[PDB]
Symmetry: D2
Subunit: 343 residues, 4 copies
């Protein structure tokens, strides 16, 4: 073929219709606003392309096969790389002044950011749960989409999410077997014994101002480290939304996290890293978007009532962090010797 | 002289003393931790060097002289550039694993993060207020310091801060004069007349859901826009800490913000931009530091039974933003034609 | 009005046709290759949109009017910001392996990067010159285009380029007037007297190997500074292509460069800076692209009998630098006191 | 200990002596110039710390042991990360104007950028050879040093470089054994038969314009792919300096490069990638340092009538790229099916 025809530039480079130009008063900066979003949507399409291919590798149940595992890790890293660029893409819109923006703002109404199907699909496919999704202007997230788009968005809710699939894989981690290696058993013993060593040692220190603080630190460290073995706490925190992964998935995640230097757990750890990197960048994107909406509209300007800036500020939270459990693995790090070994 | 002697490399490259190596068990990654902090401290010294030079240009009262104004804007931009790099410097410490970090963590005690004199001076010299700051372990920030350091740290609180100096400059903005150009007067009249025209436009509009939805938004925006002309409200918000700049400073800031395209207001706006950039990057530094402490240490782990991650997450707030008023200027943007004519 | 309809997502998100998928054997990484180029082309469209608006502000002859000058500087800075991002966009294609790329490479032929109309227009509108443009496999860039495209590409060559327009503006700089301020005169005298004083200073020093180093450097710098006032040398370098701006434009550029701290020359300098940034980033884009063609195809693999990597290596040079004269202004920097004082 | 004492800030933050201030006329921007270099030198110290630890892991001969292999790959990646930041650090010095720079430039003489011991050690320890070093003002790089420094710089030349150590490791790659798996044998046969099959499809009537260029390209590709198996050519290119790795090392590198998707060759490939990244970033550092030396003092000025810019422009070349052979692995890229099948050997 020919470059332009292969890339369908007859469609791509003929999709720029300025509403200010259509309504007479053509505003120059409107073209930047069009291109920016079109670039974002092209990248969301690519993110979904990678995400759906990764999801299907899991659905086949052959993720553990080293060749398929690499495809997952690499494509997950790619999404991380795309998102990294997408955060930097805000710097283009920083060149647009608040004044020049408002010259065309009026022509954009009533079109909303909530009408970005690709962003919504991307959120749903990762594992952003609808139940613990903050509602704007007493209106639900799916009311903006009314048609074949609503049908496609329902599929993303129903179908197995990336979190659901990663949970499944984490549950099947070798070494968790109580009759086999028994990681959870061995760990509980070394930790309880490690803390007994620690409590007596913080007591075998001179009665200073530092001790009333260290004793109180112990009651919270001991609480955190042992609550790991309390399954009822885990089941209560899951219902609240404070935890996403199942108890067995959490055990698998901790195993990979501790044995990250081991050859068998290097690549599974890389995947966990990529899942955390995707979540951090999804947050940085939301944060950089919040700043953009504050610079252009203000902390009070919204849609027929409540400010848009205050709804979006509540989306830049740990509730929107799908792989929140993976971030909390670091709260349970124990000295190297306390980790059960091998022969 | 000679490269090494000029750069005093006999001091710089002979300041790396590994505590794990001193206490026998040498940990390799400890050297990375030393170098990173030494690089940060060199950059904080440079930030303070620029900041103090900018502060003294203001103190002389000749900041309005175009030649001195350029020195300020350029040096303020430089601080923005240094901070941009310091945020990126976290990526170096991302190469250190949580496991390898804990191997030397023990040797670091009792040295703390808020024992960094340069960072504290940097906060104080910008205008981070002592009353408007969150305490860790019910202790003050100055209690960790003693002697000559505590003496130097009190000077930064007492002496005129960058905010105090910018406020002073903003108060002396030409055009605010009520018998001169009378910007504030002209503005208030234009906003009243503007809202009136906007109202009869919404009133004559065909009675719908969007007609009543627009009335609710009009009433909220009308309230907001005229709240700007209530000086006692401003005075009450200043005491609460919700605002930092004086009422006359806020008027000057709004003048530069609206007339940013004017030749007389391009450079003063660049300064306001750089000040906002500094505040944004100071936040991004705090945020990137809190992501580092959440994956190196725990969400509950800290010093003396305290927050740790939770305290450093309360610093990543608008209360630590010194130039908060400058960010809120956007919440008062009015259509281009409502802005009073300059000539 | 709806988001998708406003942004014409029915066109944009329905323009992804994988050739490997069309020919059966669907290659996954091909979709990344499509999206990447489509993103690049959307950004080239935006760069051209800004560039053409800047060019028309100049063509009206009212660029010296501070309000129009700001529009130019700001939009030129925006192009710099867009280019900065496109350089970083190569990092996306770094995730694609050489192996996975060759699985679909076959399905792309005979389509070439030389068929990117927008990139060619972008080069021509800035002021990349055809006569001093390296030819690939004994074939000119315009041979790869036909019809309406070839007609539109001819217009970009004929019409006033950004360089031609900036040159025009630089020629009309106040202070160059020999009967007025006479900058070039004052500068020539001052550089002569300055070098004389600097010579007394080096000569009165103690005879050592440090003195002979300062001598050889003074002699070299004396040659460079005095060669600036040689207009025929400039005229000869212009014909060779080693310089692009006219002698009077070069004088205006030096004036802005020295008086950059002055209120009247702050914004004109910002423009000069922006142009240099655009040239630097256009080079960094070419460099980051030649580093991808090497990694994906190799040092010797080309289209015809010629090497792809070797040709693209010849574009990452100073001949493709439109604003090359602006980069060389630093070679003529003189001590602050040698600079002629300003008239109030 | 206390933060300041642990980090020896009494040394670090008391090492800033402005020469313009010492000679009366204090220039503000001089402090930026001091801090920038001090930051660079701290990072060069850290790069050397990682580099020397990586070099000793190789010298022990236990680099193939998966646990030690990871230490190497990770620390090599860290150097890549530090260098990435060092390239971005030039943006700090971009805030300094050419005019403000020249106000203090005079006070810096006769100190030179060549007097950076750490940078020289870093170059020598990687594998930048003295035989292929471009000379400035007809003065060798070692002449700018004296005493203990000159003694320490000689050690870096003598001792096994990172290239020498990587070459050694590449030579011992499993599968190269002619009686074992015999990769080079299998590969040679497959490339010959592969080229034959392509020639039969090309030479199959349709004498057009496109067909002749396709013959010209086949003939050029056939030449390059076959010249790979000519060990005589390789040893001639090694003596010229156009290649750095030994013929057996090149074979090992190609094996990892083709079998990169294999579980046994994932981590060795990551190392090769990190080595190439280090080489790319070392170049980007030199290039960004060339742009800066052009913006300040121009393109003609330097030392003793010799151009500073022009010399640093000649260091941006492929001659300074130590792992140049690794970059050229992409030139001998063959269709997936031509690559020999992996059997347990
Ligand atoms: C001029 C800059 C921008 C402004 C002022 C802006 C404003 C807003 C506002 C006010 C909202 C809340 C919903 C609404 O009324 O639309 C929103 C939502 C959103 N915006 Fe933007 N936006 C901007 C740029 C972007 C860009 C460049 C993208 C990328 C495609 C984007 C994607 C979205 C998405 C996906 C949402 C829904 C977010 C969520 O529910 O979590 N916006 N935007
Ligand atoms: C391994 C990575 C790091 C960890 C785990 C870490 C941990 C902490 C912790 C827990 C705190 C709270 C106070 C304390 O107990 O010390 C803190 C404070 C602080 N850290 Fe670090 N830190 C790290 C890296 C850095 C770096 C690279 C710098 C730069 C010099 C830095 C500068 C500071 C400063 C200035 C504070 C006081 C912050 C405030 O009060 O707002 N930290 N750090
Ligand atoms: C897989 C990565 C890429 C490879 C291997 C590649 C390869 C090449 C090659 C070999 C050429 C020489 C002409 C030809 O045969 O096409 C070329 C030219 C070109 N490529 Fe690419 N390219 C890549 C990515 C890109 C991207 C992402 C863009 C951005 C749109 C791009 C834009 C161009 C342009 C505009 C030219 C003409 C350059 C000139 O004449 O100065 N290429 N590319
Ligand atoms: C104001 C910016 C700078 C200028 C004008 C500058 C100029 C130069 C010049 C002219 C040379 C050639 C030798 C000489 O006469 O010194 C050189 C060499 C060098 N510079 Fe700089 N330099 C600058 C910044 C830096 C920085 C920030 C570093 C980092 C430490 C650096 C490191 C070096 C090194 C290591 C060399 C030797 C390079 C080689 O032989 O390959 N320079 N510099
Ligand atoms: O409703 C939004 C108000 O601010 C301006 C953009 C408005 C809206 C919008 C309309 C058309 C095309 C894109 C976008 C967009 C992205 N994020 C929010 N949106
Ligand atoms: O208190 C911190 C707990 O985590 C480990 C580092 C601890 C502390 C620390 C000890 C020694 C030298 C520097 C620093 C530093 C900077 N920011 C935090 N720190
Ligand atoms: O001719 C190029 C050889 O390498 C593969 C891509 C080939 C060509 C190509 C074909 C189709 C779509 C885009 C591109 C592109 C960008 N820069 C070069 N190209
Ligand atoms: O030789 C260089 C000419 O330009 C000014 C700096 C000169 C020289 C220099 C003097 C003192 C301290 C550091 C450096 C350095 C690093 N790279 C170049 N330099």
């Amino acid at each position: 073929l020919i470059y332009g025809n292969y890339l369908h530039l007859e469609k791509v480079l003929n999709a720029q219709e300025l509403q200010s130009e259509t309504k007479g008063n053509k505003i120059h900066d409107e073209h930047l606003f069009i291109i920016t979003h079109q670039a974002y949507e092209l990248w969301f399409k690519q993110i979904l392309w990678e995400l759906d291919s990764v999801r299907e590798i899991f659905q086949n149940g052959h993720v553990r096969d080293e060749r398929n595992m690499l495809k997952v890790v690499s494509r997950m890293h790619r999404v991380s790389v795309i998102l990294k660029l997408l955060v930097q893409q805000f710097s283009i819109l920083e060149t647009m002044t608040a004044l020049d923006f408002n010259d065309f703002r009026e022509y954009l109404s009533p079109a909303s950011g909530f009408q970005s199907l690709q962003f919504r699909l991307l959120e749903n496919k990762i594992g952003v749960l609808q139940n613990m999704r903050v509602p704007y202007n007493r209106r639900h997230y799916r009311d903006n989409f009314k048609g074949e788009e609503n049908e496609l968005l329902l599929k993303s809710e129903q179908e197995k999410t990336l979190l659901e699939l990663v949970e499944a894989w984490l549950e099947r981690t070798p070494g968790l077997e109580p009759h086999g290696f028994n990681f959870w058993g061995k760990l509980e013993k070394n930790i309880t014994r490690g803390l007994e060593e620690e409590f007596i040692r913080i007591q075998a220190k001179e009665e200073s101002e530092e001790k009333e603080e260290q004793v109180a630190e112990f009651q919270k460290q001991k609480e955190v480290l042992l609550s790991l073995f309390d399954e009822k706490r885990h089941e209560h925190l899951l219902s609240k939304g404070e935890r996403r992964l199942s108890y067995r998935a959490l055990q698998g995640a901790l195993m990979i996290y501790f044995y990250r230097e081991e050859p068998r757990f290097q690549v599974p750890f890389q995947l966990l890293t990529s899942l955390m990197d995707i979540d951090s960048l999804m947050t940085k994107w939301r944060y950089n978007h919040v700043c953009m909406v504050h610079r252009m509209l203000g902390s009070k300007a919204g849609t027929g009532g409540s400010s848009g800036y205050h709804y979006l500020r509540s989306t830049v939270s740990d509730r929107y962090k799908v792989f929140v459990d993976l971030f909390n693995l670091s709260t349970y790090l124990i000295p190297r010797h306390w980790i059960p070994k091998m022969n």
